[PDB]
Design a protein around this ligand. Sequence first.
Ligand SMILES: *[C@@H]1O[C@H](CO)[C@@H](O)[C@H](O)[C@H]1NC(C)=O
Ligand SMILES: *[C@@H]1O[C@H](CO)[C@@H](O)[C@H](O)[C@H]1NC(C)=O
Ligand SMILES: *[C@@H]1O[C@H](CO)[C@@H](O)[C@H](O)[C@H]1NC(C)=O
Ligand SMILES: *[C@@H]1O[C@H](CO)[C@@H](O)[C@H](O)[C@H]1NC(C)=O
Ligand SMILES: *[C@@H]1O[C@H](CO)[C@@H](O)[C@H](O)[C@H]1NC(C)=O
Ligand SMILES: *[C@@H]1O[C@H](CO)[C@@H](O)[C@H](O)[C@H]1NC(C)=O
Lengths: 50, 596, 99
Amino acid sequence: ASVYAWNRKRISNCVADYSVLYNSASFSTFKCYGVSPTKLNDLCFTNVYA
Amino acid sequence: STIEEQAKTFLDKFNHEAEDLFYQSSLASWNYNTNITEENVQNMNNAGDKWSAFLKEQSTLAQMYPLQEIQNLTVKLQLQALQQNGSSVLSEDKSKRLNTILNTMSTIYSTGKVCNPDNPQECLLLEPGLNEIMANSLDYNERLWAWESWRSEVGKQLRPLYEEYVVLKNEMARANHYEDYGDYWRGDYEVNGVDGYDYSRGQLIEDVEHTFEEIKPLYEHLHAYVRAKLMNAYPSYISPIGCLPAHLLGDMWGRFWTNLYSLTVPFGQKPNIDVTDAMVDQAWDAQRIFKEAEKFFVSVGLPNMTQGFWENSMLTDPGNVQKAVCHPTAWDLGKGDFRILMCTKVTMDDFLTAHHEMGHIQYDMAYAAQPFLLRNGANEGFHEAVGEIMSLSAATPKHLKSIGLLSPDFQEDNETEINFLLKQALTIVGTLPFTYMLEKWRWMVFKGEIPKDQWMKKWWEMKREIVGVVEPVPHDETYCDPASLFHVSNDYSFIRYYTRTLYQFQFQEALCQAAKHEGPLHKCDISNSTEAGQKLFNMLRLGKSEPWTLALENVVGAKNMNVRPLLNYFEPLFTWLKDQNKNSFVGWSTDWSPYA
Amino acid sequence: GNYNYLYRLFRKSNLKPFERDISTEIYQAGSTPCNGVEGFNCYFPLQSYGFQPTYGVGYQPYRVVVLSFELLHAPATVCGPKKSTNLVKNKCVNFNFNG
Ligand SMILES: *[C@@H]1O[C@H](CO)[C@@H](O)[C@H](O)[C@H]1NC(C)=O
Ligand SMILES: *[C@@H]1O[C@H](CO)[C@@H](O)[C@H](O)[C@H]1NC(C)=O
Ligand SMILES: *[C@@H]1O[C@H](CO)[C@@H](O)[C@H](O)[C@H]1NC(C)=O
Ligand SMILES: *[C@@H]1O[C@H](CO)[C@@H](O)[C@H](O)[C@H]1NC(C)=O
Ligand SMILES: *[C@@H]1O[C@H](CO)[C@@H](O)[C@H](O)[C@H]1NC(C)=O
Ligand SMILES: *[C@@H]1O[C@H](CO)[C@@H](O)[C@H](O)[C@H]1NC(C)=O
């Protein structure tokens, strides 16, 4: 989508594997604010907004 | 709300849409230059017409915002640049006539073909047919024939066209609240609104005369030495007391004296610093030339070239099937796209040209953070000067030894420095009186000091007085001798070379003082010095946002253009020329004593 | 040139966090009413990008995905994949079965 009409996908009731994203070589920026990438694969959240 | 916020939003819209339109136009020009085909010409013409119409519509929108209600200096500078009418203030018939005159002068200069009467079956164009004859021949009457025949054909075609051109450009300039077209050209150096750093249009001519009065003894000694050597080359034509014959200067017009280095060499017996054979022996590709130039620019601390530079530039001649312009040109296409179009050979000249054009690319990259209409040099002199300083630094024997191109047991004695400095003077110092005389003549033509029936009588009088060059035979008013040169026939300013030459040595002294070089100025190399690159990049990052006087304060610590760095650069050569001119007579006579 | 990507260039006020503005109403920069037509001091707020493959790295298109993690008083259901140690029997071990 365009940045004025940015797509929001609500992610619920599943298992989120964040190490697949973190260990990928295809991403240039993976800057996390408020949480560290190492404990993302452990913690649990109510909803994820993408 | 306020006028200033309205202008700021309008400038944001202008910047954003102009950057993409300028990209499209520049890409069309690039596709024409790397591929000379008729559809690329049509696409270039369509993009240029769209770009010019967009600039007309944005200037029309821009004039509705008055200047005096805006206090921010950058916003006022962009609005001042945009609100210029250009040719739009002139009537549509006269604007069409001026455009037609410019286009037909372009066709006459580009497709001008001249050869000897009674042998008309084939003829030679200016480049490269006449350039090689002017640069390499040793025959007096052949060079006289080529010079007089090309000024006969070109001047007799261009004289009524130039007479219309001066009147139309003066009409447009006085319609644009200028005194003449010369004042319009001098308005590039005009700084208004900055406390202390203001520069006036009338101060430029005074500063040029003040610097040229200090140029004059060095040029007189160089002219006397070149006169003595050309007297040795041509025994009877050149007089000891008079000016140089016009067709013997090594180029078509007298623009540069660098083709007389073979005839006027001080110490021919001593070797040269030619590194061509060393690159041929090590098989240096043009890619290696540009990588060594990039290594030079990363050694001083400047940013290295983008990936898109290496992907998208044409650094080698494509072949017979594909046609391209051979002239080396650095392209700032917009949006972070930087390319070099050069047909690079394995020569020293192409290596120095690669450094010069990559200096142009570095200058273009430095002001990429600026808004679009401020993406230029602070004046027209800085843009060429930052390439010429790289040409100065790369040409040094220390740089050649550092990159391995010169033998480490090469002996650097005083004689090689003298003849190298003489070559640099024939290239650099010799163009200064010709440039000053041409610009002063054009300023007097636009100002109306010289009537149309008296253009040439004054002009040769100026050339004898300033350049020290005499006409072979007298010319009447059917000739148009200035307009045989590319820049004047195609509506280009010419004082940029004078300002470039002085700014070159001012920047050279500033960076060598930054680099803590302890010897002669011409022995100085700016590699390995991070602080010199930082001092350069402080001015380079500004672009057109700041006045050129403030930028010159940022580099050299002076508020005005200065002539002393040039004299300091050539001071060993100046003392050597003063020693060599004891028997001979320095200076020339304006009389017809050699030949007329 | 890929002109399928738009961005808002002008708005009267700054956006709130996680706000989407898809309005296509003419921005009024001046005192005069726009009246729905793009004239003088009145600009269309959405402007197209012009992505090309020959662009610089500061102008090339970048796809950005922002993941927002919030904890609310409802039971958290998006959990990570807890790793499982192979089962060992007949030994005194510390077992952790489903908490
Ligand atoms: C140059 O133009 C010709 C003519 O169509 C074309 O075949 C060729 O691919 C072009 N080359 C480049 C490098 O664009
Ligand atoms: C002038 O405007 C530019 C942006 O348009 C801004 O960054 C700068 O701070 C302004 N200068 C002053 C003195 O307000
Ligand atoms: C441009 O031309 C228009 C009409 O000829 C005039 O009103 C305006 O003042 C001119 N602008 C400048 C900067 O001379
Ligand atoms: C420019 O330099 C950086 C860091 O020194 C390097 O990562 C990059 O690859 C260089 N660019 C090119 C085109 O080699
Ligand atoms: C070079 O130096 C030597 C020794 O000092 C001297 O004899 C010679 O004249 C000098 N040559 C030049 C051109 O300065
Ligand atoms: C400048 O730095 C490069 C990089 O190490 C080096 O090879 C070169 O010799 C240096 N220049 C001088 C004059 O030492």
